[PDB]
From a paper:
Covalent flavin was discovered in Complex II of the mitochondrial respiratory chain1 where it is attached via an 8α-N(3)-histidyl linkage. Integral-membrane Complex II enzymes can act in either aerobic respiration (termed succinate:quinone oxidoreductase (SdhABCD)) or during anaerobic respiration with fumarate as the terminal electron acceptor (termed quinol:fumarate reductase (FrdABCD)). In their mature and fully assembled forms, both SdhABCD and FrdABCD can catalyze the interconversion of fumarate and succinate at flavin adenine dinucleotide (FAD) covalently attached to the flavoprotein subunit (FrdA or SdhA). Here, we stabilize the E. coli FrdA-SdhE assembly intermediate via site-specific crosslinking and determine a 2.6 Å resolution crystal structure. This study identifies that SdhE stabilizes a conformation of the FrdA subunit that enables autocatalytic covalent flavinylation.
Residue numbers in the entry:
A (entry chain B): 6 to 84
B (entry chain A): 0 to 49, 58 to 103, 130 to 495, 497 to 576
Amino acid sequence: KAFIHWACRRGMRELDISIMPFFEHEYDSLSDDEKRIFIRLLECDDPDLFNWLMNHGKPADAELEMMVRLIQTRNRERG
Amino acid sequence: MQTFQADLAIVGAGGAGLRAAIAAAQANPNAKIALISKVYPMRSHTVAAEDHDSFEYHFHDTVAGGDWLCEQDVVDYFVHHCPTEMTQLELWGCPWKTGFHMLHTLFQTSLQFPQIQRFDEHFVLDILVDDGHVRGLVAMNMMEGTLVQIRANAVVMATGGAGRVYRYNTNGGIVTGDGMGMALSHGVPLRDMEFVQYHPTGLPGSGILMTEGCRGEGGILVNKNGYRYLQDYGMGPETPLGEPKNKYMELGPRDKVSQAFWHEWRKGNTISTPRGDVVYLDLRHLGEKKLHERLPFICELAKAYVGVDPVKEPIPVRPTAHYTMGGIETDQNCETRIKGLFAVGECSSVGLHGANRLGSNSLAELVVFGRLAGEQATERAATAGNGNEAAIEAQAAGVEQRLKDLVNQDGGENWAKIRDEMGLAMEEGCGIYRTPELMQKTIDKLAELQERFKRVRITDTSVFNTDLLYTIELGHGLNVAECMAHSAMARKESRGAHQRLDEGCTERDDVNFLKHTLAFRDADGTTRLEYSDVKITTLPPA
Ligand SMILES: *Cc1cc2c(cc1C)nc1c(=O)[nH]c(=O)nc-1n2C[C@H](O)[C@H](O)[C@H](O)COP(=O)(O)OP(=O)(O)OC[C@H]1O[C@@H](n2cnc3c(N)ncnc32)[C@H](O)[C@@H]1O
Ligand SMILES: [K+]
């Protein structure tokens, strides 16, 4: 369950700053099986994870498009 | 210790390692090929990347762009096998973001080969060498905690660059030098490590890289005064707002635009910011209509990491460390001093890049030399016989012990902090321009840091710790950092990416330094330098 820390190291420097500190500062905050999208979304291509964060498109399973909102907004209230 | 008997093991599943693995499956269809990566390969740094009308014009621009430190026979090979490897990639499905398209095609092509057994999310800790010949490695399985012996008679290092050794950096945190480290542990020198290449527009704090297209589409670089200062540094007259010309001003030679930043720094002309000194890449004059069509991602990019809407204010940028020309020393077959052990891709020094990588030769090296390294290593897996079983197994056991002595090590130093001071010392002492005093300060700090490294605390975050792997990376970073710094300090000339301010060493010196810098590491922990000649064939120095 601390191996999702390792599903946070990405090839793009951009996702290290967008995914690794959001997993650190929060994650253990709003959990249950709403973390059912966190792990589900990490199993996606790096460009898609960069893009669906820059809103150059939207993920299909809109259960995962909600999680892209929670990572954008919770990070837009971070630093 | 589970074990897996392969013909070849490939450490690295990026552009170079994958291409190597396909090459070995196609060369010997009966082979067991272990393809190992600490990340799902589609997360290798190669995903992040975004004339040749003449073999001569390409061979000339590589050698000269590398300031005559290129292995010319390697260059001749490279230039001539570029068209083949581009063709082969398009056939494989690549439609004609180029590093993703490349890696995706290599990755999908690798799935057709049952010869290629992937070891996803496996961290390689050491290679096994006895009687001057590699005999396999030992890796940790992240997703489970266990350790695997993998025995092969050729091992191809494809671990990527040594970037995240600077505190501000364009590479994923992945790219920690692990393969260069492992070569050093076994007495293979790192070559030409002093030649690190900066990209001129990177975001402060992050190192996230602002594309050249920002300036291709007419964005300007100004200092605190809003002056387009590039005109003061030999970069032709100021071109009109909205009509850039290539090679002039913001489209000027990439090395001169970094150097310009530095001069503007020394002049008092930068802007002091949290986590750096910056200039401004200004895009306000484009307009969101232009900014949305071309350069669409760049807006959210700036909102996200520098909190700027580029339509309303300019973007803070500064030169960031980017590409490492040096790496594991290899011959024209990508084979290291240790027989059977190869290196290819950014982790290596095949002699293609000299003192400065030229354009997209970085991506093409992956498939040209990934193919060659793959073929060559197959060849050498078929002719190595066998090895003194007790020694190999003894060595594999020594990794096990070394790894447990490491856990609950006697000490109280913090690897995070040790890591950042190495990063700071790299920026200060091995940046755009070097001086014998800023290099010696940093050579010292590293020496101080590697002593503290001997006493870092791996706390019981338990199976096997993430903290323990980040520490093994740091070690690897530390050793390659000294190699850089020691080589820079010792290279008393200015060549390509390596530029010195001090008297004696401002000019390129072909009479004394037309030589490679080989950086060894002795068991005692100290850094030894040596030099080799530079294969000149067609093009003697200017
Ligand atoms: C960082 C970067 C580089 C880059 C670029 C943009 C960025 C942000 N844009 C480029 C461009 O537009 N054009 C170009 O020609 N080059 C560009 N670059 C440079 C280029 O992308 C890289 O030099 C190149 O991709 C290097 O690829 P290589 O195949 O050599 O290696 P890698 O992609 O970095 O992957 C290395 C693999 O090794 C595995 N690994 C590393 N250490 C270990 C350990 N210890 N154990 C197991 N596996 C390991 C990694 O998982 C990875 O797969
Ligand atoms: K290299």
